[PDB]
């Protein structure tokens, strides 16, 4: 838990003095995070495999909630209210501790320590991540038979310019194109 403690300790005065804000309430600190599996057989035609749901459970704090389709996607045929992938939201200390367990192991669990530079944002403060990889935590090594387990984890902040996202993900330390 101590992560967000020391994060306050450092960032509040640091980001206040480097960016002169009139009020402290203006400091952009992270609030919420969501990961989107968005697979559901990835084609919805396997129609029977949902290992995604339980791996999402025990890699996260809670269990996900399965999404569904709404319209008729041309790239597919059986898409009418059927379920495709799930999602997980979290903002409390589960958020922070998952962030820590991420930056601790999955950042070494990469094949390259360069991550991605700040080229995949939405200007006013956010960060998508690219997940076509397979192994996040060794919690799933042989139980998983290396089937495609990608994700879409999106962290978002109360910022207004991309530079804030940059500085925020740097001050805690994320692999970029340094």
């Amino acid at each position: 838990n101590r992560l967000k403690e020391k994060y306050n300790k450092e960032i509040a005065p640091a980001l206040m003095t480097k960016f002169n804000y009139d009020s402290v309430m203006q400091v952009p600190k992270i609030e919420k995070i969501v990961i989107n599996m968005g697979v559901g057989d990835a084609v919805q035609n396997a129609k029977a495999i949902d290992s995604a749901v339980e791996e999402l459970t025990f890699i996260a704090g809670q269990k996900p909630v399965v999404t569904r389709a709404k319209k008729s996607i041309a790239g597919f045929r059986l898409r009418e209210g059927m379920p495709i992938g799930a999602k997980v939201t979290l903002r409390g200390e589960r958020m922070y501790d998952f962030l820590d367990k991420l930056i601790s192991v999955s950042l070494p669990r990469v094949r390259d320590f360069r991550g991605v530079s700040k080229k995949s944002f939405d200007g006013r403060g956010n960060y998508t991540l690219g997940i076509k990889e397979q192994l996040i935590f060794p919690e799933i090594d042989y139980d998983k038979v290396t089937k495609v387990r990608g994700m879409d984890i999106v962290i978002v902040t109360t910022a207004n310019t991309d530079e804030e996202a940059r500085e925020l993900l740097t001050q805690v330390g994320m692999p970029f194109q340094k």
Partner: protein, 183 residues
């Protein structure tokens, strides 16, 4: 010599029981145009020193008349009688005439519109944000310098526009924060 502006007749009697100076009533939050003109001529001929309670209506009328007529002198209820638990309460009718004499001793606004040396950054470095020390030490230093309390930005603004020594006030700040620590 100067004129003293106060809320009503109670503060009138109170201030008159302390020092010989003519009184102008503000009659609460309701201040009139001709009243502002009277304040103008008073500051022009004899001067005026606002002295109200550090409460909501008192501070509000103080701010309004300050923004109304610049150069008008100001005074503040010292830390003892400015608080309701002392004497009868917060009203000027509740302070001692000697306390009014001290407030007269701490009159300010001889300086109005100066570019000075009071840094907001070092100010937050001194711990005037969060942790209850923001408002605690704000009140403490305000009643220390006998200037009243405010929020961080407003207190910083009035100090940064109030011509006083910087590092002597910083030493007094160390003294007061040690009082909070127990010194």
């Amino acid at each position: 010599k100067e004129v003293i502006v106060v809320e009503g007749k109670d503060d009138t009697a109170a201030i008159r029981r302390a020092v010989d100076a003519d009184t102008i009533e503000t009659n609460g939050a309701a201040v009139g145009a001709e009243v502002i003109e009277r304040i103008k001529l008073a500051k022009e001929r004899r001067g005026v020193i606002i002295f109200t309670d550090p409460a909501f209506p008192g501070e509000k009328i103080r701010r309004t008349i300050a923004e109304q007529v610049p150069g008008c002198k100001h005074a503040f209820l010292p830390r003892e009688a400015a608080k309701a638990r002392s004497g009868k309460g917060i009203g000027v009718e509740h302070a001692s005439p000697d306390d009014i004499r001290q407030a007269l001793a701490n009159v300010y606004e001889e300086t109005a519109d100066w570019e000075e040396e009071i840094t907001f950054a070092e100010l937050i470095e001194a711990g005037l944000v969060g942790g209850e020390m923001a408002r605690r030490r704000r009140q403490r230093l305000g009643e220390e310098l006998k200037i009243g309390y405010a929020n961080g930005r407003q207190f910083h603004k009035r100090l940064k526009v109030f011509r006083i020594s910087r590092d002597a006030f910083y030493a007094a700040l160390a003294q007061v924060m040690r009082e909070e620590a127990g010194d």
